[PDB]
Amino acid sequence: GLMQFTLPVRLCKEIELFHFDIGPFENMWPGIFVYMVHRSCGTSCFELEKLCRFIMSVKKNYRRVPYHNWKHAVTVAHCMYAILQNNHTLFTDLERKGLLIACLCHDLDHRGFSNSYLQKFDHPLAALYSTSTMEQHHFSQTVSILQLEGHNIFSTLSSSEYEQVLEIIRKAIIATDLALYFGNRKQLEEMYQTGSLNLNNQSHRDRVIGLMMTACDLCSVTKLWPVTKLTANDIYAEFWAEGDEMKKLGIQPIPMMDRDKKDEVPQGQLGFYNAVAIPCYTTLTQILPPTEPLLKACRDNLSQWEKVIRGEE
Numbered sequence: 614g615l616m617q618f619t620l621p622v623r624l625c626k627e628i629e630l631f632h633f634d635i636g637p638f639e640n641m642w643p644g645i646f647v648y649m650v651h652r653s654c655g656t657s658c659f660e661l662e663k664l665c666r667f668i669m670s671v672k673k674n675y676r677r678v679p680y681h682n683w684k685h686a687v688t689v690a691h692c693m694y695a696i697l698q699n700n701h702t703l704f705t706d707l708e709r710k711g712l713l714i715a716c717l718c719h720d721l722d723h724r725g726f727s728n729s730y731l732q733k734f735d736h737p738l739a740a741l742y743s744t745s746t747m748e749q750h751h752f753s754q755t756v757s758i759l760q761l762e763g764h765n766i767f768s769t770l771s772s773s774e775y776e777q778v779l780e781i782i783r784k785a786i787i788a789t790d791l792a793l794y795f796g797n798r799k800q801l802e803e804m805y806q807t808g809s810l811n812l813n814n815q816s817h818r819d820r821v822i823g824l825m826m827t828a829c830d831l832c833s834v835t836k837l838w839p840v841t842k843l844t845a846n847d848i849y850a851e852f853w854a855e856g857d858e859m860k861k862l863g864i865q866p867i868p869m870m871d872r873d874k875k876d877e878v879p880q881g882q883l884g885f886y887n888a889v890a891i892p893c894y895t896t897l898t899q900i901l902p903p904t905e906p907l908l909k910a911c912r913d914n915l916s917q918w919e920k921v922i923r924g925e926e
C-alpha cells in the first residue's frame with residue numbers, strides 16, 4: 614500500500630507532457646503504466662499483486678507486429694493519462710480506472726491487418742463480428758484476461774460499478790474503430806456549435822470518451838517530429854505487408870498499402886492530417902480546452918510533412 618513506483622527525474626517530468634515518448638526500454642513500460650495508474654486513479658484503485666499480473670498477461674497477448682504491439686498499447690495509455698491529468702475534475706473515479714485499462718487493452722491480439730483484410734480473406738473473426746471485427750475481438754480478449762484466476766483488478770467494485778466499468782471499456786475499445794470516428798466527431802461538432810453538448814448526459818459522455826480514444830490512438834501524430842517520422846515507418850511496415858497479402862488474394866491494395874507507391878507517402882500524410890488528425894484534435898480542444906497541446910503538436914507535424922513534399926527534407 615505504501616509502495617510507490619518512482620521514475621528517474623527526466624521521465625518523472627516528461628511523462629506529464631502530452632508529447633512524452635515511453636523510450637526503447639521495454640522492461641520499464643509496466644512501471645510507467647503503474648506509475649500513471651497511481652497518479653491518475655490512486656495507489657488504492659487496484660491490488661498491486663493483481664494489476665502486475667494483469668499487465669503481464671495483457672503484454673503476453675500483444676504480438677510481435679511492427680506497430681500494433683505492446684509499445685503502442687502503453688503509448689495510447691500514456692496519452693489518455695495526460696488527457697485525464699489535464700482534466701482533473703471532469704471524470705468519475707470509475708472512468709479514470711476504466712479508460713487507462715481500456716487504452717492498454719484496446720488492440721489486444723492484433724495481427725497487423727485491418728477489418729477490410731479480414732473480410733476479404735474471409736477470416737473466421739469476420740463471421741463472428743460483422744462490423745468493428747478486430748475491436749470486438751480486442752474487448753473479448755480483455756474480458757478473457759480479466760477472468761483468468763488472480764487477474765480481476767475490479768474484484769473490489771460493487772456488482773453495478775463492475776458492470777459500469779466493463780461498459781465504459783467496451784464502448785472505449787469499439788470507438789477505436791476509425792470507421793466510427795467520422796460520424797462520432799460530426800455529431801460532437803454539431804452538439805458543441807448548436808450549444809446542446811451536455812456532459813451530465815451519458816450518451817454525450819460516451820461520444821466525448823469515444824473522441825478521446827481516437828485522439829489517444831492517433832497520438833503518434835502529436836509527438837516531436839523525429840518520433841512521428843520514425844513511428845510512420847512501423848505504421849507503413851504493417852500497411853505494406855497487408856498490401857502484399859491483398860495482392861496474394863488477387864486484389865490491388867489501396868495506394869496507402871501498396872509499397873510500390875512509397876513516393877506518395879508525404880501527400881497521403883497531408884490528406885490524413887487534413888481529413889482525420891486535425892479535425893479530431895480540433896473538436897477535442899473545443900470540448901476539453903486543456904488538450905490544446907495535442908492540436909498544436911499535430912499542426913506542427915502537418916507543417917513538417919508540407920516541408921518534406923517541398924523537397925526541404
Ligand SMILES: CCOc1cc(CSc2nc3ccc4ncsc4c3[nH]2)ncc1C
Nearest residue numbers: 791831833848868869874877878881882885
Ligand atoms: C489510424 C491510421 O493512423 C495513421 C495512418 C497513417 C497513414 S495515412 C495515409 N493515407 C494515405 C493515402 C494514400 C497514400 N499513398 C501512399 S501512402 C498513403 C497514405 N497514408 N499515418 C499515421 C497514422 C497515425
Ligand SMILES: [Mg+2]
Nearest residue numbers: 719720747789
Ligand atoms: Mg485498433
Ligand SMILES: [Zn+2]
Nearest residue numbers: 719720789830
Ligand atoms: Zn490502436
